[PDB]
């Protein structure tokens, strides 16, 4: 009788964290509760009760016990390892492990969209990626995102997908649904942990062809299929040139076919990689989200909708009252994810804090040769972005400084004086 498989538990520099692998609700644990539950996980609730006996009498474990995180299924040196680990995290002052691992088994894509900066990139077997997958699993990764490139075009994709299902890792795969094999679709429809995400900009045939170079027919078909087989599905769109009418048009489609979740990502140009010109900014993206959410609730639709992108909080001057006190975890969870909450691995094995680091000319460590935990500790790229601090007047007066530090790190280092330059994305 230990901790539920549906729950993620990790030791952190401030004790520990609990996260639902479904509801995604979270609770910050202290050192006592963290060590208690760490034993509850490795030696059952009984042996855990033996230790901390005085604590239970002092109500120090009252809250921990009241949690519904338990299921059915040398403790001294196990407790020592816990203490050594927590101390090391305090030393490096980093989070335990990324919560999101993004993998790019292949960079090749059958399409070449204009809002894409990974188009035309032109691979290792799933056996290797399986090894990398185990490290993430055993180190406490919350979810794995499979991208590219068209991952359904990755030859060993079926094996990779199976490995994810077997390792019991919450996983998503993003596809254009153009040339996906029948074997691949079957694995997804019967999968319990893997969730497909469909790249679809609009139902309008003409516009989508301009944006993706294809009609939306095959994405629409695959979306309708999963609703039949009862498999959860998601739609992903980049806010480029769509009008509000074409957006709501796609909202209804998700409502009709019971799409699990619909996301609209902000669009960021990349000089020399993206052909399409940016029409809307983060302010416009906010108005859109406020528009869609009303339409969905005004129709009483159970559609999980959201907007996505970095520095989206810059479009809400209402907040940032300079009174925002962030918890030790929130201070590293919100904002730039490249710092503490995510990792990205390229097709050649190169490890990156973010995909944006691709265009950065600095040596990277290889995942097919070094351990993900070792890199997570001593990597120059992570240390660079983790330790960076802005000296901008407006930023230093800003409430969100800790999670932003004057905008996206990758953009700032390109400037003459990164420490003083504020990203144009923010106009506050």
Taking CB under 6 A as the rule, does residue 237 contact ligand SF4? no
Q: For residue 199, report the phi and psi dihedrals to the nearest 5 degrees.
A: -80, 105
Q: Is the dihedral of CA 295, 298, 302, 308 positive or negative?
A: positive
CA nearest to 37, candidates 78, 92, 84: 78
Distance between CA atoms of 159 and 129, rounded to whole angstroms? 10
CB of 264 to ligand SF4, least distance (A): 14
- Cα–Cα distance measured from residue 407 to residue 57, given in angstroms and rounded to the nearest whole number: 48
First CA to last CA distance, the chain:
53
CB 181 within 8 A of CB 152: yes
Structure tokens at 169: 């890792």
Count of C-beta atoms within a 10 Å radius of residue 280: 15
- Identify which range of 19-27, 50-58, 62-70, 394-402 contacts ligand SF4 by CB under 6 A: 394-402
Q: How far is the CB of 152 from ligand SF4 (least distance, A)?
A: 10
Find the shortest distance in angstroms from Cβ 113 to ligand SF4: 3
Helices (H), 71-156: 75-92, 126-139
Q: How many residues bind ligand SF4 (CB under 6 A)?
A: 34
Backbone φ and ψ of 347, nearest 5°: -70, -25
Closer CB to ligand SF4, residue 15 or residue 216? Answer: 216
Of 15 and 353, which has the nearer Cβ to ligand SF4? 353
Binding mask 321-340 for ligand SF4 (x = CB under 6 A): ---------------xxx--
- 8 Å CB contact between 247 and 209: no
Scanning 277-285, 300-308, 325-333, 391-399 for contacts with ligand SF4 by CB under 6 A, the matching segment is 391-399
With binding defined as CB under 6 A, does residue 409 bind ligand SF4?
A: yes
Q: Which is nearer to ligand SF4, 365 or 392 (CB)?
A: 392
- Contact between 343 and ligand SF4 by CB under 6 A: the answer reads no
Task: Give the three-state DSSP class for 424.
Answer: coil
Peptide bond connecting 149 to the previous residue in cis, omega within 30 degrees of 0: yes
Beta bridge partners of 11: 16
| Site pattern 88..127 for ligand SF4 (x: CB under 6 A) | ---------------------x-xxx--x-xx--------
E-state strands within 165-233 = 171-175, 194-199
Annotated binding-site residue? 164: no
Euclidean distance between CA atoms 13 and 28, whole angstroms: 11
| Residue 302 annotated as lining a ligand binding site | no
Least distance from C-beta 209 to ligand SF4, angstroms? 12
310 appears as a binding residue in the annotation: yes
Helix (H) or strand (E) holding 227: helix 217-229
User: Least Å distance between CB 116 and ligand SF4?
Assistant: 3
Taking CB under 6 A as the rule, does residue 236 contact ligand SF4? no
| Residue written as token pair 């530090």 | 405
Nearest distance from C-beta of residue 394 to ligand SF4, angstroms: 5
The contact mask relative to ligand SF4 for 295-314 (x = CB under 6 A, - = no) is: ---------------x---x
Per rule CB under 6 A, is residue 389 in the interface with ligand SF4?
Answer: no
Q: Which two tokens stand for residue 148?
A: 């590219």
How many C-beta atoms lie closer than 10 Å to residue 39's C-beta?
23
Q: Residue from 33, 150, 204, 260 that binds ligand SF4 (CB under 6 A)?
A: 150
| Spatial separation of the C-alpha atoms in residues 386 and 87, rounded to whole Å | 19
CB of 289 to ligand SF4, least distance (A): 18
Based on the shown chain and the rule CB under 6 A, indicate whether residue 381 belongs to the binding site for ligand SF4. no
Give the number of other CB atoms < 10 A from CB of residue 239: 22
Task: From 20-28, 133-141, 360-368, 397-405, give the range in contact with ligand SF4 by CB under 6 A.
Answer: 397-405
Residue 254 is a binding residue for ligand SF4 (CB under 6 A):
no
- Write out the residues near ligand SF4 by the rule CB under 6 A: 109, 111-113, 116, 118-119, 148, 150, 176, 199, 212, 310, 314, 336-338, 354, 356, 394-395, 398, 400-401, 404, 406-410, 422-423, 426, 428
Known binding residues are 109, 113, 115-117, 150, 199, 201, 236, 268, 310, 336, 354, 395, 398, 404, 408, 426
Known binding residues for S-adenosyl-L-methionine are 115, 117, 150, 199, 201, 236, 268
């Amino acid at each position: 009788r230990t901790i539920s498989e549906d729950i993620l538990f990790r030791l952190e520099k401030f004790g520990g964290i609990l996260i639902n692998k479904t509801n995604f609700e979270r609770i910050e644990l202290d050192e006592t509760e963290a060590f208690f539950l760490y034993l509850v996980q490795n030696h059952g609730i009984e042996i855990a009760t033996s230790f901390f006996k005085k604590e239970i009498e002092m109500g120090k474990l009252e809250r921990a016990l009241s949690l519904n995180i338990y299921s059915d299924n040398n403790p001294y040196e196990t407790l020592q390892n816990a203490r050594k680990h927590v101390a090391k995290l305090k030393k490096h002052n980093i989070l335990s492990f990324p919560l999101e691992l993004v993998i790019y088994p292949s960079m090749y894509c059958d399409l070449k969209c204009g809002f894409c900066f990974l188009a035309n990139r032109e691979a290792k077997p799933a056996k290797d990626w399986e090894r990398i997958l185990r490290q993430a699993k055993d180190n406490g990764v919350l979810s794995v995102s499979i991208l590219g490139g068209e991952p359904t075009r990755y030859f060993d994709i079926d094996n990779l997908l199976i490995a994810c299902e077997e390792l019991k890792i919450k996983t998503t795969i993003t596809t254009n649904a153009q040339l996906i094999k029948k074997s691949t679709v079957e694995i997804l429809a019967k999968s319990k942990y893997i969730t497909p995400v469909l790249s679809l900009q609009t139902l309008d045939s003409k516009l989508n062809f301009e944006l993706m170079g294809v009609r939306p027919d095959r994405q629409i078909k695959l979306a309708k299929y999963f609703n039949e087989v009862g498999k959860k599905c998601r739609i992903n769109a980049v806010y480029t040139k769509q009008s509000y009418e074409q957006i709501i048009e796609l909202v209804d489609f998700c409502i009709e076919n019971k799409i699990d979740r619909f996301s609209v990502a902000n669009y960021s140009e990349v000089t020399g990689y993206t052909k399409i010109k940016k029409k809307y900014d983060l302010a416009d993206l906010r108005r859109l989200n406020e528009y869609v959410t009303d339409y969905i609730t005004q129709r009483e639709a159970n559609l999980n909708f959201a907007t996505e992108g970095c520095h989206l909080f810059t479009a809400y001057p209402e907040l940032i009252n300079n009174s925002i006190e962030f918890s030790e975890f929130d201070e590293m969870y919100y904002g730039c994810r490249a710092k503490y909450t995510k990792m990205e691995i390229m097709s050649n094995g190169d490890i990156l804090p973010c995909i944006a680091f691709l265009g950065v000319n600095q040596t990277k460590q290889n995942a097919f040769e070094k351990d993900l935990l070792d890199v997570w500790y001593d990597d120059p790229l992570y240390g660079g972005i983790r330790s960076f601090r802005t000296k901008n007047s407006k930023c230093l007066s800003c409430g969100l400084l800790k999670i932003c530090e004057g905008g996206c790190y990758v953009n700032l280092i390109k400037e003459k004086s990164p420490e003083y330059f504020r990203d144009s994305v923010c106009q506050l």
